[PDB]
Amino acid sequence: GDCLPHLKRCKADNDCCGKKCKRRGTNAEKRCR
Amino acid sequence: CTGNQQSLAHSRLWDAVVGFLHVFAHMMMKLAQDSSQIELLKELLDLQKDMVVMLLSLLEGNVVNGMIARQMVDMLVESSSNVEMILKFFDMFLKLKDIVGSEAFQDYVTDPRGLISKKDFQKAMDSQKQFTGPEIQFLLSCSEEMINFEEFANRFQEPARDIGFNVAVLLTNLSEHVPHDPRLRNFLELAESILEYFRPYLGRIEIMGASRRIERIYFEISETNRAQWEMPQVKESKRQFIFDVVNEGGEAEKMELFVSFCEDTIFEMQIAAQISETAREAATALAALLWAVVARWGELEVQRVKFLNYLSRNFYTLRFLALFLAFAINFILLFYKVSDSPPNMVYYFLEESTGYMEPALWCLSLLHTLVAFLCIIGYNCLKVPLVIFKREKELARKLEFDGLYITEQPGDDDVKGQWDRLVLNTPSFPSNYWDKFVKRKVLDKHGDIFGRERIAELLGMDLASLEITAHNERTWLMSIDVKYQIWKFGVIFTDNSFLYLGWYMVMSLLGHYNNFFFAAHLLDIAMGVKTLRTILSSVTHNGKQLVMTVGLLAVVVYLYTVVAFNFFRKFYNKSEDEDEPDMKCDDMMTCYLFHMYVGVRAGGGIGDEIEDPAGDEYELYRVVFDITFFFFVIVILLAIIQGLIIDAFGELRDQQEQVKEDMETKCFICGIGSDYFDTTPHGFETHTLEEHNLANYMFFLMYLINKDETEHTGQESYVWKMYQERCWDFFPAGDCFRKQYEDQLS
Amino acid sequence: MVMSLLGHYNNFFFAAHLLDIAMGVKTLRTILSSVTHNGKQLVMTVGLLAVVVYLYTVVAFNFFRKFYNKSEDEDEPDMKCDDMMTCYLFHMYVGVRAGGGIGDEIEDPAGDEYELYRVVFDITFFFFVIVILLAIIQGLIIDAFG
Amino acid sequence: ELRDQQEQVKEDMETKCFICGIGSDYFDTTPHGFETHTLEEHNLANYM
Amino acid sequence: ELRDQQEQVKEDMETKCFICGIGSDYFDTTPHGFETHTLEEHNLANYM
Amino acid sequence: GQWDRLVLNTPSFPSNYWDKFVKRKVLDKHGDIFGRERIAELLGMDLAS
Ligand SMILES: Nc1ncnc2c1ncn2[C@@H]1O[C@H](COP(=O)(O)OP(=O)(O)OP(=O)(O)O)[C@@H](O)[C@H]1O
Ligand SMILES: Nc1ncnc2c1ncn2[C@@H]1O[C@H](COP(=O)(O)OP(=O)(O)OP(=O)(O)O)[C@@H](O)[C@H]1O
Ligand SMILES: Nc1ncnc2c1ncn2[C@@H]1O[C@H](COP(=O)(O)OP(=O)(O)OP(=O)(O)O)[C@@H](O)[C@H]1O
Ligand SMILES: Cn1c(=O)c2c(ncn2C)n(C)c1=O
Ligand SMILES: [Ca+2]
Ligand SMILES: [Zn+2]
Ligand SMILES: [Zn+2]
Ligand SMILES: [Zn+2]
């Protein structure tokens, strides 16, 4: 539930199994990595 | 009809079925012993096939734990003799048919005339250890001195396909219906060759029939079906469709795109069936490596048709050859040189290999032009009809269901809408669409309400009276319609791939006019493989934001240019000659051009080219101006543009990976995650192979298309009616057969 | 073994033995293998770089050819774009590593009838190569290592 | 982060009902469930 | 990563209780439920 | 694969492996299918009797 797939579009920091919702530049759609 | 099934179960049908199985097995044995009763044998298995069809119909709607399957297993164990004997007969026949194709049997034949002695056949069977002694004797008795193994094997193989399929379906349905049955498990273990042989030809599509209950549907798969399914055109089209639909993210409409893709694949299947029959060495090494990694009256008419079919078959090979030819000619173009006078600038070819480069380049250009012409012809012959079918299907569906062309209007813009309105008057509108009577359907649907005359006039029907007479019946140049041809040409001239082909043809013609124009043909390397196409799509992915940032950069540069003209004009001295100084900021246009030419790509601000203000006035002001220009141009705006492009590329690659990951963890039909199926070993693999396979669904749909409506079963008729109603509620929609009956299956 | 054996012939051959430090540590091995992790995409990006350099080279050869003068003395002018191969080598040697486009090495186009055309050419070359292709390769390597 | 916040607001409105505390997952089972739930009832324009 | 970790510390403090760790969704059923919890139930100052 | 095919008939193939009778197992498994003749030749099986 709270955990999300690897490259799933997450919402904020943590809230995922990879626990890092970093974004690769000047764009939206933060994803877990 | 639950009542009829219950009445049949409670009646004395079962004793009749036992007796029928017994007499039919004995008849089958007796006719197998004989040879002149092949017609009676064919009638017997046709009737056996019908009897199994009735048995499956009775088994339709049977719950995981129901009395019907209990009576099935009770009668199966009651009459195990005859049914076991006939299943053994089928097993040995299929085993012999498989053995005759193996090297074990071919290593014992001694007569070149295709004959082998009975004793030698018995020895071969004993060596194979497949048939028992009584089984070997029975097979010998069945065969007509020569044993004629091939003819005897293939005489009964074709008739027995239907009955073997029916019995395989029957046993599969019982095994899936009531697990944990020792008698059923033993009976399934008795016959395994038949199930293995019929496994690739058997489907296990699961649909929701009624009362939100998941049911198993078994349909027919032909050899030609899987034979044509293995082509890479259909696989590539499926990959593109699934990738696009997963990027789209649509859930409610996902089944709609799935059905559209299935229809497009069926149309492509039909079209495929129709068309079925020094520095030079270093530069050379680099080009070779790049190419290697990149690579990783009636008689005339029939001849033209055959040539077009052959060209259509090898379209991808032709495109690869064209790309290779372009690479070769541009590599040849890499050996050019300019001299003041020929051996007014003159473009003369380098001698290289004793002047062999010029005729080679000429022949390469001619061959490339010819191959490009054949490529556009093949594209028109191959992929254009699919686009025509899709457009006609969309227009007919919209007019039939949405009704926005009669009740409503297309509205402003919508060039495709105006084009579709133009072809509405054209006769034979569903030329490629399967349903050629969509006009009559929409007539009977809404035209009478909207006016029997106005609707008919808008639809451009030939004559209502003529159509009624045809329904109540109980040269080439004139046949072709100019309006349909012009509409087809117009809709062809709007497809992106046809525009690319036309651009390629124009570039080839320009290269013929001037050899240096051939460099544009290497732009096809972007479309060839997906990474460069991803880069190109990233270039325009955020076009609005990119143009907005470019506009901000332009206005900032304009403001700073105005400031520099107003105050910092003295320092703009690019020329170092005091006798004839050059003022780069004497005018707005010149200063703005200098700024946009040097200050944006300097990498350290405009101050690198501007003279040092330390020895002049306004030193602090100019230093602050340079610092803020650098910070607000290179550090901020250029970095923002670069980040936009790079993150667009990264997001595109991220989506391309995420689609694959989601498909590997979630299935397309019901979307249940693989975590639930992970408990069963290889549960997700079995689910995606048999339960919710797209190929199985499409095979079932087009088999129902092939099979007549009268022969449809209750579930098949229901699914066909739902398909005709343009409403898909029979899909699992997150319901699994194992999940529905988890308690009973455990 | 063969590098150690050849080190006797020339002492400088022993410098190849420093690759043990790259193949030994996990971090060094990861850094070395980052290139091969996404090698196909990197080679494809290099292919686009070569293709765009070829296109801009033939464009400069067709016109703005006179601006390719890298000789300070007018007694012996040097035309770096007199041939396809020489101009391509000059482009692949200077423009990609310049960091500000091909206009840095080329003289300032002042007073020429093609001033706007040359300016647009330099702008698109810079934007297409340095801002996009080099950054794409750098981001690919960084993402592979990450 | 600013662009992400804007897209975040857009996606949250495309998902959240803006009136009740239940996401679109419950209404996803019924076709057009979220559209019907946000069209007639739980509408800010309707409340105004 | 360091700035992200500090912000995440702040966000986890604002979202998850330090004492019990129950998520804010459980207390979101009642208005100002998390505020009441953090001011009366599991306050570190109260334990002090 | 071709390298492994070359070593199949080597007498010392079972070396360095605990299962030194794998030739016997494969011969027993495939004797019915292949007549116990081609399998023995492929695996060597010198002096099977
Ligand atoms: N409904 C589905 N039908 C088929 N495959 C599915 C489905 N849902 C997910 N998959 C996944 O698709 C794969 C099987 O189909 P697919 O054709 O993509 O296989 P592949 O091994 O990638 O080979 P290729 O695409 O070259 O045929 C598996 O990875 C499977 O998990
Ligand atoms: N409680 C809510 N009230 C209204 N809209 C809501 C609510 N919750 C979510 N939404 C979403 O916000 C949308 C309303 O804004 P919308 O995007 O439709 O505006 P618009 O672009 O001006 O209109 P149009 O759809 O006609 O172009 C709804 O369609 C829905 O997707
Ligand atoms: N068990 C807990 N007890 C108290 N606060 C907690 C607890 N768990 C989490 N928190 C959070 O910690 C914060 C309480 O400290 P806070 O950051 O408000 O202090 P402050 O800003 O220094 O003080 P002030 O109240 O003077 O503004 C709140 O955001 C609260 O939600
Ligand atoms: C006969 N037929 C087709 O030929 C066909 C089709 N869908 C696509 N095609 C091509 N359908 C539903 C159909 O019944
Ligand atoms: Ca019927
Ligand atoms: Zn599924
Ligand atoms: Zn609500
Ligand atoms: Zn707490």
Q: What is the DSSP string of B687-726?
A: IIIIIS-HHHHHHHHHHHHHS-GGG--HHHHHHHHHHHTT
Q: How far apart are CA C28 and CA B409, in angstroms?
A: 67
Provide the CB-side half-sphere exposure for C7 (13 A, CA): 9
- According to DSSP, residue B336 is labeled E
Q: How far apart are CA B537 and CA B551, in angstroms?
A: 21
Question: Which residue among B661, B687, B688 has the greatest number of ligand 1 atoms within 8 angstroms of its CB, and so is best to mutate?
Answer: B688
Gap between the terminal Cα atoms of chain D: 32
In residues, how long is chain C?
Answer: 146
The answer, for B120 touching chain F at a CB cutoff of 8 Å, is no
Q: How far apart are CA B176 and CA B372, in angstroms?
A: 55
The answer, for E12 touching chain A at a CB cutoff of 8 Å, is yes
Which residues of A fall within a CB distance of 8 Å from C146?
33
Backbone angles phi and psi of B426, in degrees to 5? -65, 130
CB of B663 closer than 6 A to ligand 1?
yes
Determine the distance separating the centroid of ligand 4 and the alpha carbon of B594, expressed in angstroms. 64
Q: Which residue of B has its CA nearest to C131?
A: B642
The answer, for A27 touching chain D at a CB cutoff of 8 Å, is yes
Q: Are C37 and C44 in contact (CB under 8 A)?
A: no
**B128/F32 CB distance under 8 A:** yes
The set of chains that have 3 or more CB pairs under 8 A with E is: A
Instruction: Identify the residue whose tokens are 């990959």.
Output: B239
Determine the distance separating the centroid of ligand 7 and the alpha carbon of E29, expressed in angstroms. 15
Structure tokens belonging to residue B56: 């499956």
Backbone angles phi and psi of A7, in degrees to 5? -100, 25
- Cα B148 to the chain's mean position, in Å? 45
Structure tokens belonging to residue B663: 């498909």
Determine the distance separating the centroid of ligand 4 and the alpha carbon of B436, expressed in angstroms. 11
Question: Which residue among B228, B234, B262, B263 has the greatest number of ligand 4 atoms within 8 angstroms of its CB, and so is best to mutate?
Answer: B263
Closest-lying ligand 1 atom to the alpha carbon of residue B674 = 31
Q: What DSSP string describes C28-93? A: HHHHHHHHHHTHHHHHHHHHHHHHHHHHHHHHHHHSS-TT-B--S-TTS--BTTSBHHHHHHHHHH
Ligand 3 proximal residues by C-beta, below 6 Å: E 13-14, 17-19, 38, 42-44
Q: Which residue of B has its CA nearest to F38?
A: B104
User: How far is A25 from chain B, CA to nearest CA, in Å?
Assistant: 5
Chains B, E in contact, 3 or more Cβ pairs below 8 Å:
no
**B128/F34 CB distance under 8 A:** no
Sign of the C-alpha dihedral, residues B396, B397, B400, B403?
Answer: negative
How much helix, strand and coil, in percent to the nearest 5, is found in chain F? 50, 0, 50
- According to DSSP, residue B582 is labeled -
Q: Are B234 and B268 in contact (CB under 8 A)?
A: yes
Q: How far apart are CA B143 and CA B148, in angstroms?
A: 7
Q: How many H-runs (helices) and E-runs (strands) does chain A carry? A: 0, 0
Sign of the C-alpha dihedral, residues B244, B249, B253, B258?
Answer: positive
Structure tokens belonging to residue C126: 């810079």
Determine the distance separating the centroid of ligand 8 and the alpha carbon of C128, expressed in angstroms. 55
Determine the distance separating the centroid of ligand 7 and the alpha carbon of B560, expressed in angstroms. 52
Does the annotation list D27 as a binding residue? Answer: no
Structure tokens belonging to residue B260: 């559209």
Sign of the C-alpha dihedral, residues B138, B142, B146, B150?
Answer: negative
Q: Are B83 and B26 in contact (CB under 8 A)?
A: no
* Sequence-separated (6 or more) residues with CB below 8 Å from residue C94: C102, C104, C105
Q: F26: helix, coil or strand? A: helix
Structure tokens belonging to residue B363: 């022949």
Q: How far apart are CA B553 and CA F5, in angstroms?
A: 67
Which residues of C fall within a CB distance of 8 Å from A33?
146
Q: How far apart are CA B560 and CA B629, in angstroms?
A: 8
Structure tokens belonging to residue C23: 């193949």
**C139/A33 CB distance under 8 A:** no
Q: Are B19 and B51 in contact (CB under 8 A)?
A: no
Which residues of A fall within a CB distance of 8 Å from B654?
7, 24, 31
User: How far is D48 from chain B, CA to nearest CA, in Å?
Assistant: 30
Paired strand residues for A9: A31
Paired strand residues for B347: B338
Rg (CA), chain D: 12
Which of B146, B726, B30, B36 shows the shortest CA–CA distance to B402?
Answer: B726
- According to DSSP, residue B673 is labeled B
Which of C111, C104, C105 shows the shortest CA–CA distance to C80?
Answer: C105
Instruction: Identify the residue whose tokens are 């089972």.
Output: D29
Q: How far apart are CA A7 and CA A18, in angstroms?
A: 9
Paired strand residues for B583: B573
Q: How far apart are CA B553 and CA B563, in angstroms?
A: 15
Q: Which ligand is nearest to the CA of E21?
A: 8
Q: Which helix (H) or strand (E) holds B337?
A: strand B336-339
C-beta atoms surrounding B50 within 10 Å: 13
The answer, for B640 touching chain C at a CB cutoff of 8 Å, is no
Q: Are B519 and C54 in contact (CB under 8 A)?
A: yes
Ligand 4 proximal residues by C-beta, below 6 Å: B 263, 266-267, 270, 434, 705
Structure tokens belonging to residue B7: 């009445």
Helix axes B298-313 and B315-333, enclosed angle (nearest 10):
70
The answer, for E14 touching chain A at a CB cutoff of 8 Å, is no
Structure tokens belonging to residue D43: 């509408």
The answer, for B294 touching chain C at a CB cutoff of 8 Å, is yes
Q: How far apart are CA B69 and CA B285, in angstroms?
A: 72
* Sequence-separated (6 or more) residues with CB below 8 Å from residue C44: B293, B529, B531, B532
- Cα B88 to the chain's mean position, in Å? 41
Structure tokens belonging to residue B647: 């993150």
Question: Which residue among E9, E10, E13 has the greatest number of ligand 3 atoms within 8 angstroms of its CB, and so is best to mutate?
Answer: E13
Q: Angle at the Cα of B303 (from B302 to B306), degrees rounded to 5?
A: 85
**Chain E interface test: which of A3, A14, A19 (most E C-beta within 10 Å):** A14
Determine the distance separating the centroid of ligand 5 and the alpha carbon of B691, expressed in angstroms. 27
Q: B272-278, long-range: CB within 8 Å, 24+ apart, which pairs?
A: B272/B228, B272/B231, B272/B233, B272/B234, B273/B228, B275/B309, B275/B312, B275/B313, B275/B382, B277/B309, B277/B310, B277/B313
Which of B724, B557, B665, B728 shows the shortest CA–CA distance to B208?
Answer: B728
Which residues of B fall within a CB distance of 8 Å from A10?
none
Whole-angstrom CA distances from B150 to B101, B119, B120, B134, B158 are 9, 17, 15, 21, 13
* Sequence-separated (6 or more) residues with CB below 8 Å from residue B170: B52, B55, B56, B59
Structure tokens belonging to residue B697: 């669904």
Residue B727: burial class (beta carbons within 10 Å; 0-12, 13-18, 19+): exposed
Position B312, amino acid: S
Q: How far apart are CA B268 and CA F36, in angstroms?
A: 49
* Sequence-separated (6 or more) residues with CB below 8 Å from residue B243: B656, B659
* Sequence-separated (6 or more) residues with CB below 8 Å from residue B464: B452, B456
Q: Are B255 and B728 in contact (CB under 8 A)?
A: yes
Whole-angstrom CA distances from B408 to B411, B455, B623 are 9, 13, 66
Whole-angstrom CA distances from D8 to B378, D16, E10 are 47, 11, 20
Q: How far apart are CA B413 and CA B704, in angstroms?
A: 41
Strands (E), B188-325: 205-208, 214-217
> If phi over 0 gives left and psi between -120 and 50 gives alpha, with beta otherwise, what is residue B244?
alpha
Contacting B residues, span 641-660, partner chain A, CB-CB under 8 Å: 643-644, 646-648, 650-651, 654, 657-658
Structure tokens belonging to residue B119: 């004793």
**A11/D7 CB distance under 8 A:** no
Q: Are B60 and B175 in contact (CB under 8 A)?
A: no
Helix axes B357-382 and B496-513, enclosed angle (nearest 10):
160
Q: Are B280 and C86 in contact (CB under 8 A)?
A: no
* Sequence-separated (6 or more) residues with CB below 8 Å from residue F45: F23, F27, F39
Sign of the C-alpha dihedral, residues B397, B398, B401, B405?
Answer: negative
Q: How far apart are CA B41 and CA B47, in angstroms?
A: 10
Q: A28: helix, coil or strand? A: coil
Backbone angles phi and psi of C52, in degrees to 5? -70, -35
**B522/C51 CB distance under 8 A:** yes
The answer, for B255 touching chain C at a CB cutoff of 8 Å, is no
Question: Which residue among D12, D22, D26, D38 has the greatest number of ligand 2 atoms within 8 angstroms of its CB, and so is best to mutate?
Answer: D38
The answer, for A11 touching chain D at a CB cutoff of 8 Å, is yes
Closest-lying ligand 3 atom to the alpha carbon of residue E35 = 31
**B647/A24 CB distance under 8 A:** yes
Position B125, amino acid: M
Q: How far apart are CA E40 and CA E35, in angstroms?
A: 8
Chains C, E in contact, 3 or more Cβ pairs below 8 Å:
no
The answer, for A23 touching chain D at a CB cutoff of 8 Å, is yes
* Sequence-separated (6 or more) residues with CB below 8 Å from residue D43: D19
Backbone angles phi and psi of B107, in degrees to 5? -85, 0
Q: Which residue of B has its CA nearest to F33?
A: B128
Q: Which helix (H) or strand (E) holds B398?
A: none
Q: How far apart are CA B210 and CA B729, in angstroms?
A: 9
Q: Are B70 and B180 in contact (CB under 8 A)?
A: no
Rg (CA), chain A: 9
Q: How far apart are CA B314 and CA C73, in angstroms?
A: 58
Gap between the terminal Cα atoms of chain A: 18
Structure tokens belonging to residue B741: 């009956």
Position B530, amino acid: K
Residue nearest to atom 6 of ligand 4 (CA): B434
CB of B669 closer than 6 A to ligand 1?
yes
Instruction: Identify the residue whose tokens are 């029959």.
Output: B277
Q: Structure resolution in Å? A: 3.7
Q: What DSSP string describes D14-46? A: HHS-SSSS--HHHHTSSTTHHHHHHHTSS-HHH
The answer, for A33 touching chain C at a CB cutoff of 8 Å, is yes
Position E21, amino acid: G
Q: How far apart are CA B162 and CA B42, in angstroms?
A: 11
Nearest 10 degrees: Cα torsion C7, C13, C17, C18? 150
The answer, for C50 touching chain B at a CB cutoff of 8 Å, is yes
- According to DSSP, residue F12 is labeled T
Which residues of B fall within a CB distance of 8 Å from F29?
none
Q: What was the structure determination method?
A: cryo-EM
C-beta atoms surrounding B236 within 10 Å: 11
Q: Which ligand is nearest to the CA of B734?
A: 6
Which of B606, B603, B604 shows the shortest CA–CA distance to B594?
Answer: B606
Backbone angles phi and psi of B294, in degrees to 5? -65, -45
Determine the distance separating the centroid of ligand 3 and the alpha carbon of E46, expressed in angstroms. 12
How much helix, strand and coil, in percent to the nearest 5, is found in chain E? 65, 0, 35
Q: How far apart are CA B705 and CA B709, in angstroms?
A: 8
How much helix, strand and coil, in percent to the nearest 5, is found in chain C? 70, 0, 30
The answer, for A24 touching chain C at a CB cutoff of 8 Å, is yes
Q: B628: helix, coil or strand? A: helix
